Amino acid sequence: SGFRKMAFPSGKVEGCMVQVTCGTTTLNGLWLDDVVYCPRHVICTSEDMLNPNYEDLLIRKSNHNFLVQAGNVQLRVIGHSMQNCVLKLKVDTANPKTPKYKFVRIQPGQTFSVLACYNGSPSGVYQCAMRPNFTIKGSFLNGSCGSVGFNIDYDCVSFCYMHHMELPTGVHAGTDLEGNFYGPFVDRQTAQAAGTDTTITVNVLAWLYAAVINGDRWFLNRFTTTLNDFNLVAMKYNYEPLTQDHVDILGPLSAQTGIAVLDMCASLKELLQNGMNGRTILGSALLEDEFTPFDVVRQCSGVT
Amino acid sequence: SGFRKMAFPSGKVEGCMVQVTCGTTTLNGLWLDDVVYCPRHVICTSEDMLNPNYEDLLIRKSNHNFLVQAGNVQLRVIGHSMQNCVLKLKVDTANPKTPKYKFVRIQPGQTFSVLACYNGSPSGVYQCAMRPNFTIKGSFLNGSCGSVGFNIDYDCVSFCYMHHMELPTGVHAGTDLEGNFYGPFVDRQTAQAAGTDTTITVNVLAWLYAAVINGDRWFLNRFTTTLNDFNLVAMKYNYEPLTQDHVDILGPLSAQTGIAVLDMCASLKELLQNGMNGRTILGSALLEDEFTPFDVVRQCSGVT
Ligand SMILES: CN(C)c1ccc(N(Cc2ccn[nH]2)C(=O)Cn2nnc3ccccc32)cc1
Ligand SMILES: CN(C)c1ccc(N(Cc2ccn[nH]2)C(=O)Cn2nnc3ccccc32)cc1
């Protein structure tokens, strides 16, 4: 029993972290096979970030200008290319610690672990979700760029995020491992505001099921609702609309607990309208939305 | 910017996890050098746990009864001994992945990361604190015993916890790596209730400093207090008494923010008396106490 904001074991990813320096800018790179992936803004100075022409800045850079260090040893760069907002540095040595991997582009509401790094060295690991406005609420300082987000299924690491920037509002933006930003963000220091940070309804319901499984049941009520009725309430509270796909995805948790999805929706509707009244659920005084239904099943079943 | 419940990178510890089976009981062991450490209740059946005589149960066990598997390969057990509530299985092979390590016995209020394991395989990593009643609020299922808690300072892993049991109340108890339980708990399935789970005052203040550093400042007020006045309020709310040692430990955060420790105590006193009024601090609607002052500085400075 017990329910925690759990991150994937980071070992497979730590073995891929390297330091990339170009000129006076140092950030993190991801070394997989004989390629090192890093944010293309490694070629910029802080002045360049206001209005960078990446293609023009890249012309003044050669293979020997990209310094890649894995631990205390230098990697030889034998090629470089820009793919969207990432640079791919071909090195002469395949990473011997390369795990089985995939590059995936996640959808909002999906969760992943982040291995925060500085100078190619890991500092910490935490769990987060891709918000509905395509930002992440991470913990990143200057030098953290190139730190990655990932999921692990048994032995395969699915890389989904690479860190690029912090918006003036304190939230974070980045790309998938193909260099495409999540959302409308650009790697330019300009006025970029995030849209509404709505709550991931399907995740709140998943976490309510986790609470029931773990003994916190005070919020369970005598009511039911319909998807359309629940959705009117969800709209009022800036919660994402719940779809029949979401209901289907909650099926296994509904089967385990014996609590129909629409009954749990009615419990959630009451919590939204009446609040928690000074009470807590799984040690939180607010409705948690960074656990997917898959995460709840995984944590409550002990998948390694 | 941003402040997250961050765990240490788990790689160094993943390389130490092994599976230990004795009879029909399988749990996790920690392989460091040529010794595998595991809970002594690996020798028990579920029936034995009601009233175990560990010394008597151990007499019926030989080296060949302890099956130790590291990944897919079997380790040869050439000696075994009981040290307090842990077994030390001497194996014929030193773990090649043994990091630099220390065994430390932590004090309540201190935090650490837990690498939850099943069948010698890591499933997740999360951060937690040793509660003032010597329990931990973890996420552990059956088979998780022998999973360990640790801190990492650059390259040295300080192991502080090994998981042994879940109390009937859903909280967790375990030992240091010398086999001594934290608190008064015993490895017996009996009526063991935990004492008052008081709030770690020094950690709440540390987290309030983290909030100020990260931009959440609404709770800062025009007041100050004294240690004795603050402590009267802390007693009323089941918060640990704040000592001059705690004030001293908060010195660096007080210096960074320019907010005197006693002024922050007055802000905390107001939050205790008046509540949050539906507001949040660092994404939480309650006062967080599982970040030490050291953790706040480490996260806000980017220590790898
Ligand atoms: C290449 N250089 C010197 C550089 C310098 C600065 C940035 N920026 C500014 C920026 C680019 C676009 N919009 N905003 C960043 O936001 C990078 N970054 N990422 N997470 C951070 C957390 C704290 C502090 C800085 C952080 C990128 C690149
Ligand atoms: C050796 N065997 C079969 C055994 C079997 C059961 C236990 N116990 C019971 C117990 C011993 C003392 N007080 N309570 C445990 O609490 C072990 N354990 N630890 N975390 C758990 C999380 C969920 C479920 C079980 C969990 C220990 C040992």
Q: Where are the beta strands (DSSP E) in B48-85?
A: 66-70, 73-75, 77-83
C-alpha distance from A60 to closest chain B C-alpha (Å): 31
Q: Which residues of B are catalytic?
A: 41, 145
Q: Are A28 and A120 in contact (CB under 8 A)?
A: yes
What resolution (Å)?
Answer: 1.6
Which tokens go with B102?
């220390």
CB atoms within 10 A of CB B114: 29
Q: Is A155 exposed, middle or buried (0-12, 13-18, 19+ CB in 10 A)?
A: exposed
- Torsion-angle region of residue B251: left (phi > 0), alpha (psi -120 to 50) or beta? alpha
What is the C-alpha to C-alpha distance for residues A258 and A262, in angstroms, rounded to an integer?
Answer: 12
Backbone angles phi, psi at B48, to 5 degrees: -60, -35
Which amino acid would we find at residue B132?
P
Q: Which residues contact B143 (CB under 8 A, 6 or more apart)?
A: A302, B26, B27, B28, B118, B119
Nearest of B59, B114, B49, B51 to residue B82 by alpha carbon: B59
CATH number for the segment(s) B1-14+100-197: 2.40.10.10
What is the C-alpha to C-alpha distance for residues A18 and A70, in angstroms, rounded to an integer?
Answer: 5
Experimental determination approach used: X-ray
What is the C-alpha to C-alpha distance for residues B216 and B207, in angstroms, rounded to an integer?
Answer: 11
Instruction: Say which CATH topology domain B198-301 has.
Output: main proteinase (3clpro) structure, domain 3 (1.10.1840)
Residue A124 has its nearest CB partner, among B6, B121, B284, at B6
Nearest of B131, B282, B114, B303 to residue B207 by alpha carbon: B282
Mutation choice for B interface testing from A6, A118, A295 by most B CBs within 10 A: A6
First to last CA, chain B: 17
Indicate if B15-99 has the same CATH topology as B1-14+100-197: yes
* A41 is annotated as an active-site residue: yes
Which tokens go with B256?
């960074």
Using a CB–CB cutoff of 8 Å, tell me whether B299 touches chain A.
Answer: yes
Q: Which residues contact B207 (CB under 8 A, 6 or more apart)?
A: B3, B281, B282, B287, B288, B289, B291, B296
What is the C-alpha to C-alpha distance for residues B193 and B171, in angstroms, rounded to an integer?
Answer: 10
Pairing assessment for the beta strands A156-166 and A121-129 based on DSSP bridges: unpaired
What is the C-alpha to C-alpha distance for residues B160 and B128, in angstroms, rounded to an integer?
Answer: 12
Which tokens go with B257?
């923010």
Angle between the B201-213 and B261-274 helix axes, to the nearest 10 degrees? 100
Q: What residue ranges do the domains of chain B occupy?
A: 1-14+100-197, 15-99, 198-301
Q: Are B116 and A7 in contact (CB under 8 A)?
A: no
CATH number for the segment(s) A15-99: 2.40.10.10
Q: Are B151 and B13 in contact (CB under 8 A)?
A: no
C-alpha distance from B55 to closest chain A C-alpha (Å): 30
Using a CB–CB cutoff of 8 Å, tell me whether A6 touches chain B.
Answer: yes
Which tokens go with B107?
């004090």
Q: Reduced to 3 DSSP states, what percent helix, strand and coil does chain A have, rounded to the nearest 5?
A: 25, 30, 45
Q: Is B260 exposed, middle or buried (0-12, 13-18, 19+ CB in 10 A)?
A: middle
Ranges of H-type helices in chain A: 11-14, 54-59, 201-213, 227-236, 244-249, 251-257, 261-274, 293-301
What is the C-alpha to C-alpha distance for residues B242 and A217, in angstroms, rounded to an integer?
Answer: 34
User: Which residues, numbered 32 to 91 in chain B, qualify as contacts with chain A under a Cβ-Cβ cut-off of 8 Å?
Assistant: none
Q: Which residues contact B298 (CB under 8 A, 6 or more apart)?
A: A123
Q: Reduced to 3 DSSP states, what percent helix, strand and coil does chain B have, rounded to the nearest 5?
A: 25, 30, 45
First to last CA, chain A: 17
Q: Which of A142, A161, A192 for mutating ligand 1's site (highest number of atoms within 8 Å of CB)?
A: A142
